[PDB]
Design a binder for this molecule. Structure first.
Ligand SMILES: CCCCCCCCCCCCCCCCC[C@@H](O)O[C@H](CO[C@H](O)CCCCCCCCCCCCCCC)COP(=O)(O)OCC[N+](C)(C)C
Ligand SMILES: CCCCCCCCCCCCCCCCC[C@@H](O)O[C@H](CO[C@H](O)CCCCCCCCCCCCCCC)COP(=O)(O)OCC[N+](C)(C)C
Ligand SMILES: CCCCCCCCCCCCCCCCC[C@@H](O)O[C@H](CO[C@H](O)CCCCCCCCCCCCCCC)COP(=O)(O)OCC[N+](C)(C)C
Ligand SMILES: CCCCCCCCCCCCCCCCC[C@@H](O)O[C@H](CO[C@H](O)CCCCCCCCCCCCCCC)COP(=O)(O)OCC[N+](C)(C)C
Ligand SMILES: CCCCCCCCCCCCCCCCC[C@@H](O)O[C@H](CO[C@H](O)CCCCCCCCCCCCCCC)COP(=O)(O)OCC[N+](C)(C)C
Ligand SMILES: CCCCCCCCCCCCCCCCC[C@@H](O)O[C@H](CO[C@H](O)CCCCCCCCCCCCCCC)COP(=O)(O)OCC[N+](C)(C)C
Ligand SMILES: CCCCCCCCCCCCCCCCC[C@@H](O)O[C@H](CO[C@H](O)CCCCCCCCCCCCCCC)COP(=O)(O)OCC[N+](C)(C)C
Ligand SMILES: CCCCCCCCCCCCCCCCC[C@@H](O)O[C@H](CO[C@H](O)CCCCCCCCCCCCCCC)COP(=O)(O)OCC[N+](C)(C)C
Ligand SMILES: CCCCCCCCCCCCCCCCC[C@@H](O)O[C@H](CO[C@H](O)CCCCCCCCCCCCCCC)COP(=O)(O)OCC[N+](C)(C)C
Ligand SMILES: CCCCCCCCCCCCCCCCC[C@@H](O)O[C@H](CO[C@H](O)CCCCCCCCCCCCCCC)COP(=O)(O)OCC[N+](C)(C)C
Ligand SMILES: CCCCCCCCCCCCCCCCC[C@@H](O)O[C@H](CO[C@H](O)CCCCCCCCCCCCCCC)COP(=O)(O)OCC[N+](C)(C)C
Ligand SMILES: Nc1ncnc2c1ncn2[C@@H]1O[C@H](COP(=O)(O)OP(=O)(O)OP(=O)(O)O)[C@@H](O)[C@H]1O
Ligand SMILES: [Ca+2]
Ligand SMILES: [Ca+2]
Ligand SMILES: [Ca+2]
Ligand SMILES: [Ca+2]
Ligand SMILES: [Zn+2]
Lengths: 441, 86, 48, 48
């Protein structure tokens, strides 16, 4: 009778009591283990799945190889989160706003992208009246008509709603005008961003931790900066919408992992850049001493108008002569010899010139400019190894007991069940929670 | 007759200029743009612009693309050797 | 000419070599998008 | 023999480290293959 889904009517009670009943295993002072069962609290049913996943992933092993300490240190945060979220469940439309964080973020990004493509394509707006693309209007019509239907065929409605939005925009780009359309979309984006900020403050509950806490957090100031940026973009210049594209690295995780390779080990990268600059300085010194007259660069002058010569000397002062090497030597693919004047074989210093060019090329372009790159591949290797190790740990061993997948073999406990009911990591949280709420009597 | 055309009149064409003649060139965008004299008020800013473009794009991103491919070779070889051992 | 594309299907080493770029193609595409974003910003500065 | 090698290579370990489940899931395909191939053995030049 204990198995749910009973054929005889009246199995609602058994299921309802099975849902609120948990079970753990603890130890005593005398190293004796005891099996414990008692009902879960009412407050613990308010935990969100996103918090479950965040706690499941961000927890890290300690020195001895136990996630128990860090898991316990996060219990207070989860308790406060549930206490605050219960109020939100029994609260007005603020809950409706807080439930749609993903929707607001998606609309904000799909706005910013489409309202930056227009700026990139059509600026400046000197000619917009009467079919901005005068020769392409015939080419515009069929493309705009054929864009919508193709997406919606093998795909649900929301992308069709996006296509309808695109149709509504394109029927107004040349009729109403492109600049009023951009102003309307900018105002829309500011409205959506302020709604998203309000929703984020509502969901996070930053107000309970004080002013200093809600101004010292990275994410809130992060979201406020692009509210300010959208305000400036609508009020100062349409080019400020370009900075909004930097949210792409935050929205995606693979981009964050890719970028983290260059900055996880950025100190050797910076020091290698400094070493390259030192080498460039030494070569500039040698060139200033010996080949000062060989530093002749071709240059074209601006239209004189207000007010012939074609070559200027660039090693007159040692700073300018360093700038020459640092600009035209590193960028050129064949060392500094590509930009410097090429001598004849009759020169007294022709052999020294060839030695100088080859030595510069081999020490800088071959060695240092590529030793910089080698570090990046090293950090990819390190990051992949770390990620695979974490994945193996989570998918093989147990969160609390720490026993690996094989030890639970043959024994009538299928590991995959050893964790489902016996050593479940969330029953421990529920039982810790109820201790903090039940009276001591 | 004329030999030079302006390519930053409209911002789309001026993006196309960088995306075509900047990425393909081995030394950043400074190879294709006109090279100024040292007497320009913005000569130092011009050098800063060229070096910054080169270092952020050609050195960093265009090679961070390639690093991923070698990472996937390492991953694939490890997987294949593991299967063969099993 | 399009018939030469059967070479990757006939051989296995070519398939394994090509599979490296597409097994993890999402970060490659996103890095290309990042490069395009940087190019856009530099074009804006140059236009200004 | 080609089916033998394909089953030997394409089978992959499960979460617990056992190829038994996937090997069993391919049994029906092999049975149907043998049933259909017996007809081909006793068939005209289509077998050639
Ligand atoms: C010219 C470049 C124009 C590129 C336009 C991108 C087209 C939108 C692609 C949307 C989607 O397919 O790609 C997503 C990735 O989007 C890309 O990052 C878009 C970046 C493009 C930025 C172009 C820079 C514009 C500057 C032009 C100068 C991957 O997510 P996915 O799992 O597949 O399912 C969609 C789920 N969504 C809707 C929540 C995203
Ligand atoms: C990427 C962001 C770059 C800056 C966004 C564009 C800023 C632009 O829209 O404003 C310019 C601002 O130019 C300012 O002189 C420079 C201020 C600082 C701007 C930073 C330039 C980017 C350098 C980044 C390093 C021009 O001002 P404008 O809207 O036309 O008003 C002038 C109209 N008048 C002549 C009638 C008065
Ligand atoms: C106050 C100053 C605010 C400055 C914000 C931008 C500075 C970027 C340096 C911080 C880098 C790091 O702290 O941010 C990382 C990620 O943030 C990125 O730096 C986004 C920065 C976007 C602007 C920079 C464009 C890249 C060039 C991780 O922190 P977090 O914010 O918790 O990420 C949340 C995890 N998610 C993404 C999965 C939800
Ligand atoms: C191309 C530019 C690459 C760097 C841009 C990075 C923007 C934010 C992305 C962020 O997630 O990456 C961090 C970027 O942090 C940097 O402070 C931001 C770099 C500022 C931009 C550099 C410009 C270089 C171009 C010249 C690097 O890792 P970090 O989250 O810090 O923690 C690593 C652990 N450490 C500190 C112990 C090593
Ligand atoms: C090129 C990309 C450079 C990205 C730098 C990423 C930075 O955040 O990482 C720090 C690099 O710090 C640098 O020394 C100073 C750079 C800080 C400049 C902020 C970003 C500007 C990027 C350069 C332009 C890590 O080094 P650091 O924290 O020092 O001490 C090492 C940690 N140990 C001691 C445990 C090993
Ligand atoms: C990043 C790259 C590293 C920064 C160094 C780049 C230097 C830019 C070029 C500077 C040089 O070309 O100008 C000198 C300017 O010299 C000045 O003393 C130096 C002041 C200006 C240089 C500093 C500007 C860059 C400092 C900021 C570094 C980081 C900038 C990053 C901003 C985002 C020459 O002055 P000038 O007199 O005509 O030359 C005539 C030579 N004579 C006299 C022998 C005939
Ligand atoms: C892949 C590469 C990424 C795609 C972008 C490449 C863009 C091709 C060059 C487009 C540009 O050069 O032409 C513009 C054309 O502008 C049009 O509005 C754009 C329509 C045509 C551009 C779209 C063609 C590419 C879209 C398809 C992308 C993928 C194609 C892949 C096919 C296999 C300029 O028009 P025009 O007027 O003369 O310029 C005069 C400037 N004035 C007015 C200031 C004097
Ligand atoms: C990218 C590096 C190159 C960008 C160089 C800035 C734009 C070049 C310059 O023409 O714009 C400045 C106009 O202001 C800029 O928009 C502000 C400088 C951009 C910020 C530089 C780095 C700041 C770190 C953030 C010039 O102002 P300034 O040299 O002052 O005085 C000259 C007198 N004027 C203004 C009448 C011509
Ligand atoms: C209906 C649309 C048909 C389109 C066919 C070509 C699309 C290629 C994308 C699919 C890639 C993948 O599915 O194909 C791989 C292999 O197929 C390759 O894509 C061949 C494609 C050749 C044409 C593309 C040229 C490469 C550019 C593995 O599938 P499979 O077909 O089972 O391989 C059999 C295993 N063999 C080769 C050892 C016998
Ligand atoms: C150079 C072009 C390289 C890509 C051509 C690939 C042709 C078919 C070869 C096929 O075997 O590779 C796949 C190619 O699949 C792609 O759909 C075909 C790519 C289309 C051609 C890209 C052109 C890029 C040049 C710009 C990549 O792996 P896939 O079999 O998908 O499964 C990986 C597992 N995932 C999906 C979970 C990551
Ligand atoms: C450059 C080569 C690009 C090859 C793309 C290979 C593609 O098939 O791989 C997919 C890349 O998808 C891209 O986002 C969309 C590209 C699809 C375009 C078809 C081939 C055209 C190549 C680009 C030109 C894998 O990413 P996705 O399946 O999304 O989700 C990741 C799987 N997770 C969630 C389990 C981690
Ligand atoms: N100690 C542990 N060792 C290993 N994995 C664990 C452990 N505790 C929990 N897990 C895994 O993390 C998941 C999170 O537990 P959760 O409360 O979500 O379980 P559930 O309610 O039975 O499952 P679901 O909500 O997915 O239907 C578990 O289902 C299990 O897969
Ligand atoms: Ca050069
Ligand atoms: Ca190299
Ligand atoms: Ca070129
Ligand atoms: Ca490179
Ligand atoms: Zn356990």
């Amino acid at each position: 009778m204990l198995k749910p889904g009973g054929q005889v009517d009246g199995d609602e009670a058994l299921e309802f009591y099975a849902k609120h009943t948990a079970q753990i295993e603890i130890v005593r002072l005398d190293r004796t283990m005891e099996q414990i069962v008692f009902p879960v609290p009412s407050i613990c049913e308010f935990l969100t799945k996103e918090s479950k996943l965040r706690i499941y992933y961000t927890t890290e092993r300690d020195e001895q190889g136990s996630k128990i300490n860090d898991f316990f240190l996060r219990s207070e945060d989860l308790f406060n989160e549930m206490n605050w979220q219960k109020k939100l469940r029994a609260q007005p439309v603020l809950y409706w706003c807080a439930r749609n964080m993903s929707f607001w973020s998606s609309i904000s990004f799909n706005l910013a992208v489409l309202m930056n493509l227009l700026v990139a394509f059509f600026y400046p707006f000197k000619g917009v009246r009467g079919g901005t693309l005068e020769p392409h209007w015939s080419g515009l019509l069929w493309t705009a008509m054929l864009i919508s239907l193709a997406i919606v065929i093998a795909l649900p409605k929301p992308h069709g709603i996006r296509a309808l939005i695109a149709s509504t925009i394109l029927r107004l780009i040349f009729s109403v005008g492109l600049q009023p359309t951009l102003f309307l979309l900018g105002a829309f984006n500011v409205c959506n961003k302020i709604i998203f900020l309000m929703s984020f403050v509502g969901n996070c509950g930053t107000f309970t931790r004080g002013y200093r806490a809600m101004v010292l957090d990275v994410e809130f100031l992060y979201h406020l900066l692009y509210l300010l940026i959208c305000a400036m973009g609508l009020f100062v210049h349409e080019f400020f919408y370009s900075l909004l594209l930097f949210d792409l690295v935050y929205r995606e995780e693979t981009l964050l992992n890719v970028i983290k390779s260059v900055t996880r080990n950025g100190r050797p990268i910076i020091l290698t850049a400094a070493l390259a600059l030192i080498l460039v300085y030494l070569f500039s010194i040698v060139g200033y001493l010996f080949f000062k007259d060989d530093f002749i660069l071709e240059v074209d002058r601006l239209p004189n108008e207000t007010a012939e010569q074609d070559k200027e000397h660039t090693c007159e002062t040692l700073l300018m002569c360093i700038v020459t090497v640092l600009s035209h030597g590193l960028r050129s693919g064949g060392g500094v010899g590509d930009v410097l004047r090429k001598p004849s074989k009759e020169e007294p210093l022709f052999a020294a010139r060839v030695i100088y060019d080859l030595l510069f090329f081999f020490m800088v372009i071959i060695i240092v400019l590529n030793l910089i790159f080698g570090v990046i591949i090293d950090t990819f290797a390190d990051l992949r190894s770390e990620k695979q190790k974490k994945e193996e740990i989570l998918k093989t061993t147990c969160f609390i007991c720490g026993l690996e997948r094989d030890k639970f073999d043959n024994k009538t406990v299928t590991f995959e069940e050893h964790i489902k009911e016996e050593h479940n990591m969330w029953h421990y949280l529920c039982f810790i929670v109820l201790v903090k709420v039940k009276d001591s009597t």
